[PDB]
C-alpha cells in the first residue's frame, strides 16, 4: 500500500475541521482583534478530543504620537494600520518596537492548573529580540516584507505547523503586558475526533528563558585566547539552560536570541544534554553554531530543520537561530536538561534568550514560569539626553506650537475612543469564538 | 522502531516501478512528443492497482513567423527548439504566449464516465495566467531560467509529488485546444501493487474555475474606504468559488491567479468554507493573503505549504499564489464549498482563476467541467492597430520584399511537413506507452 | 487519530538517545579531531539495535607553506584554523584543494565483511569535485559562506537526515588517503531500541563511481548535430553506471559531478533503469537535466528532492546535481542497474562521477569498492611550469632570503609537533567514543 | 600658469550671481509653483548680458480620483504630494502618466520672434517617453528613487549644466498643454556680466521631433534578413531627422526615444550627417547603438558622453538613449542635417522621438515648432473595455455606494479650490521673479 510523507492524503478520516479566527463577527472588514493593554484575552477554548493543525497570525502595535488631519472616526473603518510616512505631515502612528516581547501566547490543555505553552508572542513564532527575520523552516515560517525588515516590531506573517493534540480541552490566550493595545489577526485550524486519542498521547509544550547577563567568568578575555580555550567544563553546572523538564516525552528544538557584547564570537559553547537525571551529559556537542548545523559562524541560511532567522552581520550585535529535532527528537523517560555553554566553558556574559519546544504525556509536572515584562525587553543602546532649550520664539512660532498642541489635545482622545470600541469587539468575539466551537463539537458529536 | 517522515525508506515494499515517458522509441534523441493542434493524446493508460508517485514535464510552443536559412529537414534533427535571437536574421520561431491555457491535462480513474483531473496544463503545474514563476513547495515545483522569466509562455520544468492512487485504471491525457502543436517532454513515475488498495482509498482530483469579471458591487469604489469596509457579508452567496464538490474526502489547497484592475489591493476578501451542506460557513478566515499565510499584501516568498509564484510587483497587475493543506487538510463527509470573498464582501470585479486540489473516495459524484478555450486566455492590453501605408518603394526595395515573400512561401510548408512527421511519432508512442505498461503489469502479476 | 508527516511527534518511543561527537574529552575547546595523514580512524562503534537519525560535520585542511611570527605552541590552543590573509606577512596556512576526495567516509553494519557506505567524504555530503556549493534539500544540506564559496576545498557545514537502522552494529570511520591530516568536527546522533528491528529492515548504503573519460564514440562531434541525434541506443550497454546492485531494496537517488570538455551541453543522455535483470530498461527517461527535474539545461535551483549544488555557469566547465527519490523510490526484488547515457547514445567523453544512495535488506552481497585516490582528484587546468631564474642578488637580498629560510627551518617542525599532538588526541577520543557508546548501550538495556 | 578643466576656479570673475526659483515668496514651505492647466507661465525674464549656468527641477502631477478622509484645506498646507498607498482607503491622488510630454519648456533669447528651446519638459531633461530613468552624464542627470522607477510620470530630480549665454534677454517659460495643473520646483542659476559677450557668441538651442510611425519600406520583413541587408541607401532622403538647421554653430548631441514593434532589433540604421548643404553625407556611421557608442545592442550603461537612460530589457519595447558631442561637436558654417536610418535603409516603421541640442550665433533663422500635444503621447497598449454591470445590490451595498458618491460630490470641489489658490501663487511669483531679477540687474549695473 501507499508509503512516504504524503501517504495520509490517500485515506479519509472521519474528523470535523474547526477554526478559531479574528474574523469580523459583524460580517464587515475588521477581521482582527484590538487586544487591550494590560489584559489577557482568550482566542478560544476547544473541547477535545481534537488536534491543532495550523496557526497563522499577524499583528501591528502603533502608538499615536501626533495629531492627524485624517478624521479619526472615519479612519477607524478604513485600513486598520496607517502605513503613511511621517514626512507627509498628516498623521504619525509610530511603531511600538518591543510589543512582540510584551505579549505572551499561553496554551493550557485538558483544564490543567498550569499552562503547557507560556512564551512571548514573538519568540513563540520565531521572532527573536522583538525583531523579525524573513525565513522558512518545516514547522515555522515568517513572511516579512524587505521594506519593513531590519527594525524592532516590524509587521510580518507567522505560521506554525507543529501539531498540538488534546483529549479534553485546548485554551489559547494572549497575555498583553504592554501599556498599548495591539492588533492581532489569527486563523487557528484544528480537527475534532469522534473517539478519544490514546491516553499516553504526547502534548505540545513551549517555554521561554533568558539569562541577561550570562554569569561569565571571562567576559573581558578575548574569545579563543589560549587562556580561555584551556579552561575545562565537563559537568556544565553554569551552562545556559534551554529546558529543564520532568516527565516522559521528547524535545523538538529551540530558537535562540543572542546579543553579543565583545565583538568577537559568542558561539564556542557546546550543547550538553542530560537525559533522565545523569550527572554528566550523555550528549556532548562541539559549538553553538555546530548545534544549529552551521560552521565557522552562523550563515545567512534558513533550512527545513535549522539555521538563521536574524544574522549578526545585519544587526547591532544580535543573532536569532533555530534548530528543529523533527526526525531526530531528544527523548526522555523521567527528565531532560537541554544546556549550551555560554561561550567556551561559560566564559561569556552575553544576553541569551530561548524558546524550547517539546512534547510530553500529561500531567505537566513542571510548573512553567515567565520572567516579568521588564526582564523581556531587548538591550538597545540609548541616545544621551539632549536638554534642548527653545530659542526666543516669534509670536508666529509660538502660535504654531499652541495651534498644534490644541489639535493634539482634541485628536488624541478621539483615537482613544476608537481604540476602546475595537477592544470591546475583541472581548465580545472572544466569547463568540468559544460558543461557536462548543456548537460545532456538539453538532459533530450528535452524528 | 523507526519513526518520522523518512521511516518508509527503512522497509521494503513488494511493488514494481513503471514510467510513462516521451522517450524516443526509435532510440534516438527526440525524447519528446509533438502534441498535434486541436487533438487529444494519451500519455498513457496504466492498469491498477497502483499509484502515481511523481510527474515531471517541460514544454515549448513556437510559431514559425519568418523564413529561415537553416535547412528545415536537417533542422528537424538538431535541438528541438531554435532559441536564436530574431535580430540575427536567420530564423524566427516566435513564442506562443497562451499555450499553457490552451492545453489541458485530463486524468480519468478506474474507467469512470467523468475525469477526476481537468485543468489547463499550466495551472495544474502552478503556472498561472500562462505566465511561469520560479518556485519550490513540497508537492509542486517550477524551475524557470531567469533569462526566460517575465514572459507569457516561457519554458520551464514542472514537477508534482502529490500521490495518485488507483485500484483499477489510470488514463492520463493532454487535450490540446491550440491551433498550434506543442512539444511535451514527460516522465510519469508510478508503482504497481500485488493486492487491491483499501475501499476507503482517496483518489487525487483537480478542477479549474474562473470568474472574469467577478460580480463586484463596488469596483469603482476605493478598496478599504469606510463605505466598502462597513458592508456585511455572512453567508457569502456571491463569494468566488474555488471548489464545490459532493463526496467524502479532503481539500488539499489551490493556486489562485488574480489580475487586479483598480491598482489598490485585491486581497481583503475572507476564505469561507462550508462543510457538509451547512448554510453559514463554519471556517471563517480574515483576508486573501491571510489564507495564503502572508500578511499586509503578498510577499516574494514561496514556502513548503504556501506563497507567491508570480508577484504583482513584477507584472502588469497580476499575482499567482498557492496554499497546500498537506498536514491541515479540510475534510468533508458529504460536501465542501471552498469560497473567498472577491474583495471585502465581494466589492471587486477582478479576473480570478483557480486550481482546486482534493482527494475523495470514488465515485466522482461531481461531473468536472472546464470553461471553453476562449474563456481561459489571460486578459492583456493590446496595442492600437497601426494602418501602416508603405512609402513609395524603390525597385531594390520591391525586389527585396518579393525575394523575401518567395523565400517564405517555399520555407513554411517544409516546416509544416516536419511538424506533421513529429506528430505521427507522438501518436505512435502514445499506443506503445500503453502497450508496454500492459506488458509490465502482466509480467509483474505473473510473478 | 493524528495524521500527516508530523504525526510521530504525538507518540512517545522508549528509545535512548546517543551521540558520537568530536567533543574535547579534556573538557576544553578543541571539539574537533585532527585526522592523521594516510590513516583510518573510527568516529565510533555502536551496538544495535539502533538508528542513526542525524549527522553534522565540518572540516578544514591547511598546508603550512610559510613561517609564522605567531608563537606555534600557543597558536595550537587558539582558534583551530588561521583564516588570516597571506598579504599580512604573518602566517600562511594554504587551503588543501582536494581533501574532500582524498578522505572517505566508511560505514559497516552488523560486522559484515564489506562496508555498506564507502564514498569520498565530500561526495557523501553532496560536495562534488571537492568544490562546495551552498544548498538545502530534505535529506542533505551544505551551509557555505559566500566569502569561502567558488574554490576547491572551501570549509562548510554538512548535514545528513537519511535514517540508518542497524540491528547489531554500526561502525563509522574516516579513511584519510591525504598526505596531510585534516580537522573534522562531527555530531552523529542515533537512538537505541529495547527490541530488535524487523529482520526485513532496509539498511542505508552508498557507493561512488567515476568514468573519466567516459568512453564516447563522438566527443569531437557537435552535441545535438543531426548526425549525433540520429544514432540509436536502446539497450544502454555503454551507459554511465550510477548503481549496479544485487539484493532487495530501493534506490533513493544520487549526486552527479560532470566536467564537460566541448563547451556545448553534456546532458542529452537519458536515465535508463534496469529492474530485476531485464535486458532492456523498463524505466526510460528523456535527458540528464530532465532526470534532475530541470529543463533546457540545469538552473541555479536546489529544491527538496532535486536540483543544482554547483552550477556550470559559476565554474570552469563543471556541474554538481542531485535527485532524491524519497516518496518515489526505485524498488527492486533481485537487482537494480541505474544508468544515464553519457551524452545522447553515449556520444561524449566527459568526466562523470556520482554517489548512489539506496536501502536494502542484509546481506550486502557485493563488496563496495572505491577507485584509488589518484583516480578521485578533480581535473583542473595547470599553469605551464615557469622556470624562474633569480637575478643577481644584492647582499641585503641574499641576507633576507637566508633569514627567511632559517625562520622556516625552525618554524615548520614546531607546527609538525603540534599536528602530532592533535592526532594523538583523535586516536585517544576514537577509543573513548566506542567505550562510552557501550556504557550507554549496557545501562539502557539494564533498564 | 594653471591648466586643466579646473583652471577657471583659480581666477576671479567680476560677475553677479542671480537665481530664478519656485521659492515661497510668502516665506513659508510651498517652495513650488502649481503650474495651471492649459496655460503658459514665465519662470523668469533676465536682462543680459549673462549666462544660465545650472538648472535643477522636480515635478509632480496627481489627479484626484477618490474622496479623502484627510481634511483638504489643512492637507493643502502639509507636504505637497500625498505619497500614500490607495490600499489604505484614506486618499487617492493617482499619477498622471504623460505630464512630461504634455508640458513644454520654452526659452527665448534676446526678444527674438522664435524660442531657441521648445522641447517637452521631460525630453529636455532626458526623460524620454514620459518614463524617467536614473542616470548621470556630464551635462544632464536624473536622480530617480528605485521605489518610483519603472512607471510613466515617476517623480525625479533633473539637472542641466549646459551653459546658455545671452547678450540682451533670457525668457524661460513652461507651456502646460495638460488638462491638469502640475507642481514644479525649480532653481535656475545664472551670472550677469558688466560688459557684452562677443557678438559671435553661440547661444543654446534645442528642438524636439517625432516620426510615429517612421515611413518604413519593410516593417514586416525580419531585421537582418539577407533581403533587408542588401537594400542600398547612400543619400538618406528617408532617414529619421534629428536636426535640420540653417546657421553657424555646432551640434552637441541628442536623446532618442524608440518604441520597437517587431521584437527583433531597431538599431541597424546609420547616423548620417550633412554639413553645409552637401548632397551626400560627409559623416557616415555604422549603426544606431554605434552612434550612441554601445555595440551589439544598447547596454545598461550611462557614461559622461553617451549611453542608456531607459533600457529596452526593462520596458514594454522602448529605449531612451543619449550622446553628448562636448569635446567632439559637429560644426557647421551654413547648415547641418543630423539623420539616422530608421533601421537599415529606413526598413522599419517604429516610434522615434528625439531632442536635438546645438549652439549657434543669432539670429535663429527659422521658427522652432513642435507637434501638438495629441502627437506627443507615448504609444501604450490599452486593456479592452470591461463593460462591467453591477449585480443586484443589497440595500446596504446601495447605501455604501450613495454615501461614497456623496463624499466625492463634496470632496472634489474642495480639492479644486486648493489647486486654484496655489495657481494664483504661481502667477503672482512669476511676476515677482522677473521684478527681482530686474532689481538685481540694475543694482549690479549701478555698482
Ligand atoms: O564550526 C566549527 C567551530 O568554529 C567555531 O566558530 C566554533 O564555535 C565551532 O565549534
Ligand atoms: O494581513 C492583514 C490584513 O491586511 C490587509 O492587506 C488584508 O488583506 C489582511 O486581512
Ligand atoms: O529539458 C528538455 C531537453 O533540453 C535539452 O537540454 C535536453 O538535455 C533535454 O532532454
Ligand atoms: O555594434 C555592431 C553592430 O551590431 C548590430 O546590433 C548593429 O546595429 C551594429 O552596427
Ligand atoms: Ca566548543
Ligand atoms: Ca477581510
Ligand atoms: Ca535524450
Ligand atoms: Ca548599419
Numbering used by the authors:
A (entry chain F), B (entry chain E), C (entry chain D), D (entry chain A): 3 to 449
Give the published text:
Here, we identified the BBDE_2040 gene product from Bifidobacterium dentium (α-D-fructofuranosidase and difructose dianhydride I synthase/hydrolase from Bifidobacterium dentium [αFFase1]) as an enzyme with α-D-fructofuranosidase and α-D-arabinofuranosidase activities and an anomer-retaining manner. αFFase1 is not homologous with any known enzymes, suggesting that it is a member of a novel glycoside hydrolase family. αFFase1 did not catalyze any reactions when DFA III or inulin was used as a substrate, and there were no significant peak changes in the reaction of caramelized sugars other than those of the four peaks. These results indicate that αFFase1 specifically catalyzes the reversible hydrolysis of the intramolecular α-(2→1′)-D-fructofuranosidic bond of DFA I and DHL II. Because of the significant bias of equilibrium toward DFA synthesis, we propose a common name difructose dianhydride I synthase/hydrolase for this enzyme (EC 3.2.1.134). Each monomer consists of β-jelly roll 1 (residues 3–200, green), β-jelly roll 2 (201–396, magenta), and a 51-amino acid–long α-helix at the C terminus (397–448, blue), englobing the whole structure.
